[PDB]
Design a protein around this ligand. Structure first.
Ligand code: CDL
Ligand code: CDL
Lengths: 61, 72
């Protein structure tokens, strides 16, 4: 059974189910994408902190 | 004939004589057909029912947009 698109609300259904769809997508991506990203971000900071200290142990008096 | 009498008495409230029907049918030409179809059938809603091996059936929207032409 299918209804003609000229006889349906076609934007309200998107928002009626917004919270359920957003929960499903964001829950799926959390562990696999976010957890490795936080680790990569931290490594970027540790790297930049060791570069500065290494410049002063060689050039500063 | 009896079916024609009874059916017309309920539908129209009267029986139409044969001569009247033929007079109304005579003055309908191609330009009057175009007027009526443009008003009721052109770019209109359709309903569909089917049964059997229907793997190659058109989409409802295909049938809906075949009610108008893009040529002209
Ligand atoms: C941040 C940028 C992104 C955009 C903004 C953010 C996104 C949301 C904006 C708000 C739009 C949605 C409004 C609510 C829903 C409306 C439809 C509807 O069904 O509502 C009634 C419906 C209930 O009604 P109903 O009684 O059940 O059914 C009634 C209908 O018959 C039901 O019938 P239907 O379901 O078949 O549909 C009805 C139909 C009929 O709707 C109408 O009423 C017809 C309206 C005709 C006009 C259409 C809009 C055209 C606008 C173009 C721009 C202007 C041009 C003019 C010249 C401008 C010159 C400056 O609806 C429409 O067609 C919707 C038209 C609006 C489209 C959105 C336009 C947004 C942008 C506007 C500005 C342009 C962009 C900027 C560029 C220009 C400036 C630089 O309620 C809902 O749908 C729930 C509402 C809750 C949802 C809204 C959530 C908002 C918050 C989330 C977003 C937060 C920001 C972004 C976060 C993410 C990024 C970080
Ligand atoms: C420097 C930059 C300059 C760039 C400028 C280039 C030109 C840009 C053109 C922009 C056009 C935008 C409007 C698009 C509407 C298309 C026509 C339409 O409504 O189709 C309805 C047509 C039938 O609708 P229906 O709902 O099935 O039936 C309703 C009625 O019951 C059916 O009632 P019916 O039986 O009376 O109707 C039968 C149907 C006949 O239906 C058919 O049997 C199929 C019709 C063919 C598909 C529609 C034409 C568009 C196909 C795109 C081809 C692009 C090739 C790219 C190659 C580039 C090489 C560099 O009648 C027609 O539509 C006849 C054609 C009308 C005369 C020609 C005007 C339209 C041509 C549009 C442009 C294509 C030529 C560009 C070539 C570029 C070469 C450099 O829809 C389809 O066939 C479905 C798919 C359509 C896809 C459309 C894609 C549009 C893209 C156009 C852009 C062209 C790309 C140019 C690239 C340039 C790079 C250098």
């Amino acid at each position: 059974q299918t209804i003609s698109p000229y006889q349906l609300k076609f934007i309200y259904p998107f928002w009626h189910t917004f919270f359920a769809r957003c929960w499903c997508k964001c829950s799926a991506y959390a562990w696999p994408w976010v957890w490795p990203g936080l680790i990569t971000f931290g490594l970027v900071k540790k790297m930049n902190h060791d570069v500065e200290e290494d410049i002063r142990d060689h050039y500063w008096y | 004939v009896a079916e024609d009498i009874g059916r017309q008495m309920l539908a129209y409230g009267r029986r139409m004589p044969l001569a009247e029907f033929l007079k109304r049918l005579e003055v309908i030409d191609a330009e009057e057909v175009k007027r009526v179809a443009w008003k009721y059938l052109h770019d209109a809603e359709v309903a569909v029912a089917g049964l059997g091996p229907l793997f190659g059936m058109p989409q409802l929207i295909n049938l809906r947009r075949a009610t108008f032409w893009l040529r002209y």
